[PDB]
Design a protein around this nucleic acid. Structure first.
Ligand code: SF4
Ligand SMILES: [Mg+2]
Ligand SMILES: [Mg+2]
Ligand SMILES: [Mg+2]
Ligand SMILES: [Mg+2]
Ligand SMILES: [Mg+2]
Ligand SMILES: [Mg+2]
Ligand SMILES: [Mg+2]
Ligand SMILES: [Mg+2]
Ligand SMILES: [Mg+2]
Ligand SMILES: [Mg+2]
Ligand SMILES: [Mg+2]
Ligand SMILES: [Mg+2]
Ligand SMILES: [Mg+2]
Ligand SMILES: [Mg+2]
Ligand SMILES: [Mg+2]
Ligand SMILES: [Mg+2]
Ligand SMILES: [Mg+2]
Ligand SMILES: [Mg+2]
Ligand SMILES: [Mg+2]
Ligand SMILES: [Mg+2]
Ligand SMILES: [Mg+2]
Ligand SMILES: [Mg+2]
Ligand SMILES: [Mg+2]
Ligand SMILES: [Mg+2]
Ligand SMILES: [Mg+2]
Ligand SMILES: [Mg+2]
Ligand SMILES: [Mg+2]
Ligand SMILES: [Mg+2]
Ligand SMILES: [Mg+2]
Ligand SMILES: [Mg+2]
Ligand SMILES: [Mg+2]
Ligand SMILES: [Mg+2]
Ligand SMILES: [Mg+2]
Ligand SMILES: [Mg+2]
Ligand SMILES: [Mg+2]
Ligand SMILES: [Mg+2]
Ligand SMILES: [Mg+2]
Ligand SMILES: [Mg+2]
Ligand SMILES: [Mg+2]
Ligand SMILES: [Mg+2]
Ligand SMILES: [Mg+2]
Ligand SMILES: [Mg+2]
Ligand SMILES: [Mg+2]
Ligand SMILES: [Mg+2]
Ligand SMILES: [Mg+2]
Ligand SMILES: [Mg+2]
Ligand SMILES: [Mg+2]
Ligand SMILES: [Mg+2]
Ligand SMILES: [Mg+2]
Ligand SMILES: [Mg+2]
Ligand SMILES: [Mg+2]
Ligand SMILES: [Mg+2]
Ligand SMILES: [Mg+2]
Ligand SMILES: [Mg+2]
Ligand SMILES: [Mg+2]
Ligand SMILES: [Mg+2]
Ligand SMILES: [Mg+2]
Ligand SMILES: [Mg+2]
Ligand SMILES: [Mg+2]
Ligand SMILES: [Mg+2]
Ligand SMILES: [Mg+2]
Ligand SMILES: [Mg+2]
Ligand SMILES: [Mg+2]
Ligand SMILES: [Mg+2]
Ligand SMILES: [Mg+2]
Ligand SMILES: [Mg+2]
Ligand SMILES: [Mg+2]
Ligand SMILES: [Mg+2]
Ligand SMILES: [Mg+2]
Ligand SMILES: [Mg+2]
Ligand SMILES: [Mg+2]
Ligand SMILES: [Mg+2]
Ligand SMILES: [Mg+2]
Ligand SMILES: [Mg+2]
Ligand SMILES: [Mg+2]
Ligand SMILES: [Mg+2]
Ligand SMILES: [Mg+2]
Ligand SMILES: [Mg+2]
Ligand SMILES: [Mg+2]
Ligand SMILES: [Mg+2]
Ligand SMILES: [Mg+2]
Ligand SMILES: [Mg+2]
Ligand SMILES: [Mg+2]
Lengths: 208, 82, 96, 137, 99, 122
RNA sequence: AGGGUAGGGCCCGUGACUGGGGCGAAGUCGUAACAAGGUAGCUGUACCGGAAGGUGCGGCUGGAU
RNA sequence: CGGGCUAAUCCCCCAUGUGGACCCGCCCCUUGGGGUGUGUCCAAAGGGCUUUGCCCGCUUCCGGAUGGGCCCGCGUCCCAUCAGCUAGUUGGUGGGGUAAUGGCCCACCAAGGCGACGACGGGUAGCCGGUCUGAGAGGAUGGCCGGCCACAGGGGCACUGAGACACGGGCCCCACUCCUACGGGAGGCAGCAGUUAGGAAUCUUCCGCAAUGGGCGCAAGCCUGACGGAGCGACGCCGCUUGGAGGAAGAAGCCCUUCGGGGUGUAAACUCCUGAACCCGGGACGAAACCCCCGACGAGGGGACUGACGGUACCGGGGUAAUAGCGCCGGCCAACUCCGUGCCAGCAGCCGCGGUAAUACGGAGGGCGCGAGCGUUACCCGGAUUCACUGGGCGUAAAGGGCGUGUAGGCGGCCUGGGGCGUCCCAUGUGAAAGACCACGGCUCAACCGUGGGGGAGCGUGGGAUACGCUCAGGCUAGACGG
C-alpha cells in the first residue's frame, strides 16, 4: 500500500518541514527543528552538488511523499493532467488535492492525511450523505462531505473539530462546523497553496 | 429470417443490451445491420430504455420479428400503438 | 453412437434414387427426339420433345431440378429440334 | 537548364549574400507573377522588365537591412532564407488543410493555384492549395 | 459503374481480341514523386476492327473468357505507333537481360 | 540519392541478428551439463571461472557460465539457462539459473538472492 | 487420391581427410611496416622464398631531405 | 439377407391455369432488361379446435427484405546468388455444365499469353478493424473482441439439399490405434473439461437454461459445454490493508569514532483512539415477457410461475494491532562507511572493478526506489538523425563506376490556344459496430462497461477554376546541332 513507515526521515532528507503527523510537527520536538540534516550515517557530512536529475527527483518525492501516494497513483494523475487540457501543472495539482483523504484533512478533520485516510478508509466519513471508505475518491465541486453520523459520537473528531471552529479554511472550502459537514467548493490554483514545491521540476522529471 | 433482439454488452454482471436488427444466423453479439435502441435492464438510469419506434416499425413492416422480451421492450416503446 | 442423422442419411438414397432416374429419363427422351430431328420424322420428333418438357418441368416441381436449369434443358432442347428440322422440315405438330 | 524557378530563387539568394543593388534573370510571366508577390510582401524592392543584348530579363531590385556596428557591420538580410520546395524531381502538392505556415507566421510559401499565385495566407483566405513553389524569409 | 480505360493496342495477333495497354500515373506513398505504372488488358474486338496503334477506351465487361473482361468501348485516335515502339523496344531490350 | 533511386531501390530496412540463437526465440531452455569445469578469461583479468557446457532440447550445446560461489553441478545435472554473455569469456554467451532443477543457489548468500536462487533465512 | 518403375532440380543435416580463418598466450624464428624504420612506402600483376616478405615491369605520392 | 401386409403433410398420373417456363415473330430497351401473341409444360395437403368459420400449414407468380456466388480497378513480405515462364498454355467457333460469366470442363482452328512496372522458383505468413511504440512521417504487429477466408487425422469424391461437396453425414484409399468369442468389427476433441507427450510455461474431467441468443413447436415445453456464472493461476490493469495520534535531547542491541561522539530513531516499548478479518440478523437488482382472464388470439388493460451465480455482494449490530518483501548504492543513475579478502573466491548491460586501505566481490550497519509486488531473460518500437519522405551522406574518416557510346527510364528554356490526366475547391454515398479522442452517467472510486457528441485520409458519382506538371496544335530563338 502507501508508505506507512518512519516519516520524519522524509522531512529530514528533504531539508523541509512536512507536517506529516499533526501537532509535533509544530512542537520544538521536531527533527528538522532538532536535526534538520539528512537521516542515516552521513547526514552531518557536507552535501555535494546534486544532479539536475537528482533535483527533479526531489520536488517529486517531496510532493509525492507529502500525500503518501504510490508512485503509480502519481503517474496516472499526471498522465491524467498531462493528457488533460491547459496547464498540466495546475490541473494535476487540483487533481491531487481533489482526493478525499486530503480534503478531509484539508477540512481539518484530522492532523494528518494519514489520519484522513484511516478515517476515510474506515468510512467514518460521508459525501452527499453517501459513505465512502475510498481514500482515492476524486471529489469534484458540489460535493457535500459529512462525518459519519454513526461516528459523530467520537471524541477524536471533536478534539480536531474543536480546534477548528473558526480556523481559516481554504478559499475552495467551507466548514459548517458542529454539523461536522464541510463542503468542497471549486478546484484551486497554484497560488491557492504555496507548497514547498516547484511543480514544473516534476514536469521536467517525467519528461525523461 | 432477420429478427430483432438484444445484444448483451457491458461486462460480467453488467447487462447493457443493444436492441438491434440482424440475422438470427449471426452470433448473439456479432455483426448487425442497424442499431435501433438500447436498454439498461437493471434500471441504473432514469432512461434505461429507448426505441426508434419509427424505424422499429420500419423493419417489422418489412417482416422482421423480435424476441419475446424485445417485443416487450418494443411494447413499452408503444410501437404497437394502433 | 447413434443420431437422427441415420434417419436423415437414409432418406437421401431414396430421394437420391428418385432424382437420378428422372434426369436419366429426361436426357433419354430429350436426345431421343433429337436423333429424329436429324431424320425427322417431324411429327414423331415433336411428340417426344413435348414429353421431355413435362418430365423436365415436373422435375423442377421437386428437388430434382431448378427452374432456370429445366428452362435451359428446355430451351436448349427446343432450339436443337427446329434447327435440325430446318434442313428439311417441316413440323407436323406443335410446337410452336 | 532544369528548373528556372529555383534558378530564379537561386540567383536572388546568390546576390543577397553579396549585397547587390540589383540582379538579372531570364523572363517568364510565371517568374514575374512570383516576383509580384515578393515585393507586395516586401522581400524585394520590385522588378522592371529590362532587356539584355536582345534578350528579355527581370533585373530585380534588392532590399537589405541596415548597417551595423560590431565587427561584422554587414546589413542583415531581408530574405534570411529562400529555398525551393516542389521540384521536377519531386512535385509537391498540398490541400488547403495541409498548407504550412512558414516560421510560425514570419515567412511565407508561394503557391501556384487555379486562382493565381498566392501566399500561405492568401490561399487559406481563398480556401485553396496547389504546387508549393517555395518557402522564404 | 463500368470502369473506362484509355489504353493503346499492342497486339492484334489473337483473333477477335486485342491487347489494350493502359497506362496510369500517381504519387509515391512515401516519396511524393509522380510515378508511371502501366498494365495490359485484353479487349474484345468482335468485328476485328481495332488495329495496331489505335488508342482506345476500354470498359469493364462481363467475362468473355479467362483473363478477358473488358470490351472496347470506343475508338479515340489512330496512327499512334510511336507508343508501340516505346512498348516493343522494351520487350526487345529484354533479350539482353539474361545469362 | 535521387528521389527516383529511392523509388527504384528504396532503402534497406536492415534487420537484427539475435544474440541467443540456441534459444529458438524462447526465454528459457532446459539443458543437461556435459563439461563441468573452469575457464580462464582473456586479459586483463585472471582467474578460473565456473563454466557449464550444456546440451539442449533445442539440440544445440553451449557453454553456460555458473554464477556465484559454490554450486552442485556435474554431468547429467538437469539445468536451466538464460540469455547473457560474459564479455571476458569468449565461447560463453548464456547464463545458468541457480535454485532451478539439479542446480541449487548460493550458500550463506544474503544479498541479491533472487539473482542467485537463495531463499530467506530468519 | 494414390501406389509402383525410372530419371532430373533444389535445400538441410553428416562424413575419413583437408584448407584457411577468429580468439586466447606468459612460448620459437627472425624484425617486413610506422623516423630517410635503417633498401622511401603503397599498389596491379608475375616469379621466387621456412615465414613476415624479396624482386622484375609499369603506375600513384598517401615520399622524407 | 429375404419372403408378405399397412398410413400419411411420402411418392405418381389426369383435370382446372390467376399465373410462370421455352421456342419463333414483333415494340421498347440495349449484353441474356420489360411487354406482347400462337403451339407445348407444370401446382397442391392435410391436421386441429368450441364446426357453413376460424387458426396452422400446402401450391404456384410478382415484390420486399437479409444472407450470398461470380467479375473488375488500386494496395498487400523477403531473396535477382531464382531471368526467363507457358500446350488448357492466350484467343476463337461449337457443345456440356451451373443459379449464373468463364479455359470451369471436351472437341476442332489459330499461335499466340506473362515478365526488370521483377514473370517463373524458393523462404515466410492467415488478411482488415485494430494493437503497441512514436513529437510525428514511420516502424513492429494481427491473441483476445468484430468481419471475411481456409481446414475438420493426411488426400480424393459425389449424393441430400433453398443452401455444403458438410468437424460431432455418407462412399473409398492411406497412415494409427483399439475391441474381439480370432470368423471379424470400430474410431477420428482444431467443440466444454480432461489425459499423454513435446515445452520456459498456460486452468476445472464445476452449476445451470434464471437471462440473452438459437432450432423445433400454436402453445405448453425440449435441446442446448452458445451463452450466464463458479473455481485455478500476481498472468496484466484498478482498488485496499499490514494501523492512527501522543510519544526522550533520545532504552538495549547493532554500525561508525578523532573515544568528547556519531547513526539507526519517532522507530519500539507503553497511553489513548479507530477497528481487516472472523460471529450473528437481514438479504436483493438482475425478472417481464411467452402463457392464462376481458377484449377480437390483435391495441390496451389486469393475473401468476420461475434466480445458476447464492444466502454472494450489499444493509445492521457487535468486534481482534492485524503480512513485508525485492532491486539497487564506481559513472551513466538517487543512495556511504566498517571488516573479510588480496588478479584468488567473485560482480559485469556498456566504459571497466580485484595484484594488503576495494564508495565496483561477500557480509553488516546505514541509505535509494518501488511496493504485493520486486527483479532477470527473451522479443517488439524508442532513443538510432544508425536505410535519413519529413530527415544523412561520398578529396584524406566506409562510399564516384577505369573511361566512353548508347536503349528503357527520370528530367526537361520563351510566348499564345484547345482538352482538363495529375492538382485544387464544394456538394454527396460508402468509410459497420467495438476501440482511440471530449463531455457526462452506474458499480461507495478506479480498472471495467454504458450514452451522446465531434473529424479524417482513401476511393465511387456530379459541378468548377486553370498558375505549375502533362497532352494536342501555332509561333520564337537565349540550350544543342550546322554553314
Ligand atoms: S513535521 Fe517534524 S515531527 Fe513531523 S514528520 Fe516532519 S520532521 Fe518529523
Ligand atoms: Mg496539457
Ligand atoms: Mg516522454
Ligand atoms: Mg439410355
Ligand atoms: Mg427445383
Ligand atoms: Mg519536401
Ligand atoms: Mg584484472
Ligand atoms: Mg533433453
Ligand atoms: Mg546429480
Ligand atoms: Mg541479454
Ligand atoms: Mg537484489
Ligand atoms: Mg503421381
Ligand atoms: Mg494404392
Ligand atoms: Mg621493406
Ligand atoms: Mg625495419
Ligand atoms: Mg624501410
Ligand atoms: Mg609488384
Ligand atoms: Mg613452396
Ligand atoms: Mg628474391
Ligand atoms: Mg619502379
Ligand atoms: Mg596513369
Ligand atoms: Mg596519385
Ligand atoms: Mg610520408
Ligand atoms: Mg394405402
Ligand atoms: Mg401436369
Ligand atoms: Mg450451388
Ligand atoms: Mg483449365
Ligand atoms: Mg496448330
Ligand atoms: Mg507493371
Ligand atoms: Mg526487387
Ligand atoms: Mg505478421
Ligand atoms: Mg501473438
Ligand atoms: Mg478473429
Ligand atoms: Mg484438410
Ligand atoms: Mg478431411
Ligand atoms: Mg487431430
Ligand atoms: Mg479423413
Ligand atoms: Mg465429413
Ligand atoms: Mg467448407
Ligand atoms: Mg470432432
Ligand atoms: Mg480439449
Ligand atoms: Mg515435460
Ligand atoms: Mg476458463
Ligand atoms: Mg435456455
Ligand atoms: Mg429462449
Ligand atoms: Mg394450445
Ligand atoms: Mg413430454
Ligand atoms: Mg443432448
Ligand atoms: Mg465463446
Ligand atoms: Mg507511532
Ligand atoms: Mg448471514
Ligand atoms: Mg432483481
Ligand atoms: Mg462493522
Ligand atoms: Mg503493534
Ligand atoms: Mg532495480
Ligand atoms: Mg553496485
Ligand atoms: Mg572509486
Ligand atoms: Mg532509474
Ligand atoms: Mg551519486
Ligand atoms: Mg551485485
Ligand atoms: Mg576504456
Ligand atoms: Mg579494503
Ligand atoms: Mg497493487
Ligand atoms: Mg533496439
Ligand atoms: Mg530520449
Ligand atoms: Mg526519428
Ligand atoms: Mg552522415
Ligand atoms: Mg578509404
Ligand atoms: Mg574517375
Ligand atoms: Mg531517350
Ligand atoms: Mg515546360
Ligand atoms: Mg498548355
Ligand atoms: Mg484535370
Ligand atoms: Mg467508428
Ligand atoms: Mg461517479
Ligand atoms: Mg462510445
Ligand atoms: Mg485526429
Ligand atoms: Mg471524406
Ligand atoms: Mg471528383
Ligand atoms: Mg491550357
Ligand atoms: Mg514527360
Ligand atoms: Mg512545338
Ligand atoms: Mg547561342
Ligand atoms: Mg556551333
Amino acid at each position: 500500500g502507501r508508505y506507512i513507515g518512519p516519516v520524519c526521515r522524509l522531512c529530514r532528507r528533504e531539508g523541509v518541514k512536512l507536517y506529516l503527523k499533526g501537532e509535533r510537527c509544530y512542537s520544538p520536538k521536531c527533527a528538522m527543528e532538532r536535526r534538520p540534516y539528512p537521516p542515516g550515517q552521513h547526514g552531518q557530512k557536507r552535501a555535494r552538488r546534486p544532479s539536475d536529475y537528482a533535483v527533479r527527483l526531489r520536488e517529486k518525492q517531496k510532493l509525492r511523499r507529502i500525500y503518501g501516494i504510490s508512485e503509480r497513483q502519481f503517474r496516472n494523475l499526471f498522465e491524467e493532467a498531462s493528457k488533460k487540457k491547459g496547464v498540466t501543472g495546475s490541473v494535476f495539482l487540483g487533481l491531487l488535492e481533489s482526493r478525499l483523504d486530503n480534503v478531509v484533512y484539508r477540512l481539518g478533520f484530522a492532523v494528518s492525511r494519514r489520519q484522513a485516510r484511516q478515517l476515510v478508509r474506515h468510512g467514518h466519513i460521508t459525501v452527499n450523505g453517501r459513505r465512502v471508505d475510498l481514500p482515492s475518491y476524486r471529489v469534484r465541486p458540489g460535493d457535500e462531505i459529512a462525518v459519519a453520523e454513526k461516528s459523530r459520537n467520537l471524541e477524536l473528531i471533536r478534539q480536531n473539530l474543536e480546534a477548528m471552529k473558526g480556523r481559516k479554511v481554504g478559499p475552495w472550502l467551507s466548514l459548517d462546523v458542529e454539523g461536522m459537514k464541510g463542503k468542497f467548493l471549486r478546484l484551486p490554483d497554484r497560488e491557492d497553496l504555496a507548497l514547498p514545491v516547484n511543480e514544473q521540476l516534476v514536469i521536467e522529471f517525467y519528461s525523461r | 429470417m432477420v429478427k430483432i433482439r438484444l445484444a448483451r454488452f457491458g461486462s460480467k454482471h453488467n447487462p447493457h443490451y443493444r436492441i438491434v436488427v440482424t440475422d438470427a444466423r449471426r452470433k448473439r453479439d456479432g455483426k448487425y445491420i442497424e442499431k435501433i435502441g438500447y436498454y439498461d435492464p437493471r434500471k441504473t438510469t432514469p432512461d434505461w430504455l429507448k426505441v426508434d419506434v419509427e424505424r422499429a416499425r420500419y423493419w417489422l413492416s418489412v417482416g422482421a420479428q423480435p424476441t419475446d422480451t424485445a417485443r416487450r421492450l418494443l411494447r413499452q416503446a408503444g410501437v404497437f400503438r394502433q | 453412437r447413434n443420431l437422427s442423422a441415420l434417419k436423415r442419411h437414409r432418406q437421401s438414397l431414396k430421394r437420391r434414387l428418385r432424382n437420378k432416374a428422372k434426369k436419366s429419363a429426361i436426357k433419354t427422351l430429350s436426345k431421343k427426339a433429337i436423333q429424329l430431328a436429324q431424320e425427322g420424322k417431324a411429327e414423331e420428333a415433336l411428340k417426344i420433345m413435348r414429353k421431355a418438357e413435362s418430365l423436365i418441368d415436373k422435375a423442377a416441381k421437386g428437388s430434382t431440378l431448378h427452374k432456370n436449369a429445366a428452362a435451359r434443358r428446355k430451351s436448349r432442347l427446343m432450339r436443337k429440334v427446329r434447327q435440325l428440322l430446318e434442313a428439311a422440315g417441316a413440323p407436323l405438330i406443335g410446337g410452336g | 537548364l532544369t528548373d528556372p524557378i529555383a534558378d530564379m530563387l537561386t540567383r536572388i539568394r546568390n546576390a543577397t549574400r553579396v549585397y547587390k543593388e540589383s540582379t538579372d534573370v531570364p523572363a517568364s510571366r510565371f517568374k514575374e507573377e512570383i516576383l509580384r508577390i515578393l515585393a507586395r510582401e516586401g522581400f524585394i524592392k520590385g522588378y522592371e522588365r529590362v532587356d539584355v543584348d536582345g534578350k528579355p530579363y527581370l533585373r530585380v531590385y534588392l532590399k537589405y537591412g541596415p548597417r551595423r556596428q560590431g565587427p561584422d557591420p554587414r546589413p542583415e538580410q531581408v530574405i534570411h532564407h529562400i529555398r525551393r520546395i516542389s521540384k521536377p524531381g519531386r512535385r509537391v502538392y498540398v490541400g488547403v488543410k495541409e498548407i504550412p505556415r512558414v516560421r510560425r507566421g514570419l515567412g511565407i510559401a508561394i503557391l501556384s493555384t487555379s486562382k493565381g499565385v498566392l501566399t500561405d495566407r492568401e490561399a487559406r483566405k481563398l480556401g485553396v492549395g496547389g504546387e508549393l513553389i517555395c518557402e522564404v524569409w | 459503374p463500368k470502369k473506362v480505360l484509355t489504353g493503346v493496342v499492342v497486339s492484334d495477333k489473337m483473333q477477335k481480341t486485342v491487347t489494350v495497354l493502359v497506362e496510369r500515373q500517381f504519387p509515391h506513398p512515401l516519396y511524393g514523386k509522380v510515378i508511371k505504372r502501366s498494365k495490359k488488358y485484353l479487349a474484345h474486338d468482335p468485328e476485328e476492327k481495332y488495329k495496331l496503334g489505335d488508342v482506345v477506351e476500354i470498359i469493364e465487361s462481363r467475362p468473355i473468357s479467362k483473363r478477358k473482361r473488358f470490351r472496347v468501348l470506343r475508338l479515340v485516335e489512330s496512327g499512334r505507333m510511336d507508343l508501340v515502339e516505346k512498348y516493343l523496344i522494351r520487350r526487345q531490350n529484354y533479350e539482353s537481360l539474361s545469362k | 540519392p535521387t528521389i527516383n533511386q529511392l523509388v527504384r531501390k528504396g532503402r534497406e530496412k536492415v534487420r537484427k541478428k539475435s544474440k541467443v540463437p540456441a534459444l529458438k526465440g524462447a526465454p528459457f531452455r532446459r539443458g543437461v551439463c556435459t563439461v563441468v569445469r573452469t575457464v580462464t578469461p582473456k586479459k586483463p583479468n585472471s582467474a578460473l571461472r565456473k563454466v557449464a557446457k550444456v546440451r539442449l532440447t533445442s539440440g544445440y550445446e553451449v557453454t553456460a557460465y555458473i554464477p556465484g560461489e559454490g554450486h552442485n553441478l556435474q554431468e547429467h545435472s538437469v539445468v536451466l539457462i538464460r540469455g547473457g554473455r560474459v564479455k571476458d569469456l569468449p565461447g560463453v554467451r548464456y547464463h545458468i539459473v541457480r535454485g532451478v532443477y539439479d542446480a541449487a543457489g548460493v550458500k550463506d548468500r544474503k544479498k541479491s538472492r533472487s539473482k542467485y536462487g537463495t531463499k530467506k533465512p530468519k
